[PDB]
Amino acid sequence: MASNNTASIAQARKLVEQLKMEANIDRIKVSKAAADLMAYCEAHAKEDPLLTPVPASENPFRE
């Protein structure tokens, strides 16, 4: 509806909904989320071969 600036109020309703779910969605502090990411990354560091030397036949790109 144009005379309401092309129903820009629908964006307001969507933002109401966005606040609703963002509040419903739990808020995880930055420090502990970072801790979880450290745990996953360091636990996966050895199997990330980018972090490790690769022999001339281990990769399928020197085969």
Binding site: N5, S8, Q11, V16, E17, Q18, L37, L50, L51, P60
Partner: protein, 339 residues
């Protein structure tokens, strides 16, 4: 009138969201915990240069098989490579040139491409005939097909032009559901390993995480300062790395529901044109509008290494699903298999 009142209401809602994030905002433990083992500088050498292209490479996408990359050149050419031997499994001319996006399906045999054609071209790699006969030509798009990613064998997301990031049923060639709400064009998409939540990065600098199982948005990450080039989910899908035409990368966490941590860079100022995660997701590889790209630590926010050896900008990145290497859809017409 009261339209301005509803706009105010939206403003105060965003203010509340900012307040909730700020309360959720804590000290980033990863950067202060910089006593983690140093990332150093990884001297990175490509074992296989993919000179099969002779035009610029705009998009590229490894497959679920994690051996075939579908690097698309804007001249209307798809090169389904053999990354392990530098052989062209397929070389497909495209009905229209200036293709900017190419994705490889969970089928492992379907490939998608989007140009200025406004028609999403899905090519069946394997048929009874043995040649790459096109599977489907999904029309109905309004703007240019800014980015495309395969949801399923018959479901796909096409962040098209005209603020469109709709879902499409490949078999019917029609939209499955309509995803809309952005005021800017949608040109960035990201695939979570969940494969059920896609964060679309539009030109209004709004990383809207949409849920594919509903016809409505899930989260709306912001903090961007320019249109979002590429978005890469973590190998857990718990957070995504975001790059826009700014001099800093960003990392938005869904559990925090806020920008978890930003990768400030003043040693390089070129816009972040592509973002990626390593096998662990510890290494965040950033493609840059200059020839040489980089890889920074997602933990200590420092450069793990430099992707050097290029002669023109890299327009897309793709890491091995085994983490053996990364292919760089550069503009020097060679994809460099950086092992």
């Amino acid at each position: 009138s009261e339209l301005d009142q509803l706009r105010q209401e939206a403003e105060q809602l965003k203010n509340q969201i900012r307040d909730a994030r700020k309360a959720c905002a804590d000290a980033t433990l990863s950067q202060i915990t910089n006593n983690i083992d140093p990332v150093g500088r990884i001297q990175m050498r490509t074992r296989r240069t993919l000179r099969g292209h002779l035009a610029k490479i705009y998009a590229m996408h490894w497959g679920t098989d994690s051996r075939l990359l579908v690097s698309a050149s804007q001249d209307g050419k798809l090169i389904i490579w053999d990354s392990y031997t530098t052989n062209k499994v397929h070389a497909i001319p495209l009905r229209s040139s200036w293709v900017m996006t190419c994705a490889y399906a969970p089928s492992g045999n379907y490939v998608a491409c989007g140009g200025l054609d406004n028609i999403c071209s899905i090519y069946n790699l394997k048929t009874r005939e043995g040649n790459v006969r096109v599977s489907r030509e999904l029309a109905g798009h309004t703007g240019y097909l800014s980015c495309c990613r395969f949801l399923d064998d018959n479901q796909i997301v096409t962040s098209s032009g005209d603020t469109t990031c709709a879902l499409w049923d490949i078999e019917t060639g029609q939209q499955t559901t309509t995803f809309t709400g952005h005021t800017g064009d949608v040109m960035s998409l990201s695939l979570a390993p969940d494969t059920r939540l896609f964060v679309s990065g539009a030109c209004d600098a709004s990383a809207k995480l949409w849920d594919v199982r509903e016809g409505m948005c899930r989260q709306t990450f912001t903090g961007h300062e320019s249109d979002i080039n590429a978005i890469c989910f973590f190998p857990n899908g718990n957070a995504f790395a975001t790059g826009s035409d700014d001099a800093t990368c960003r990392l938005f966490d869904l559990r925090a529901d806020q920008e978890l941590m930003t990768y400030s860079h003043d040693n390089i100022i070129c816009g972040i044109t592509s973002v990626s995660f390593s096998k662990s997701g510890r290494l965040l590889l950033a493609g840059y509008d200059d020839f040489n790209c980089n890889v920074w630590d997602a933990l200590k926010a420092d450069r793990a290494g430099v992707l050097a050896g290029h002669d023109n900008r890299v327009s897309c990145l793709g890491v091995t699903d085994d983490g053996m290497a990364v292919a760089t859809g550069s503009w020097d017409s060679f994809l460099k298999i950086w092992n």
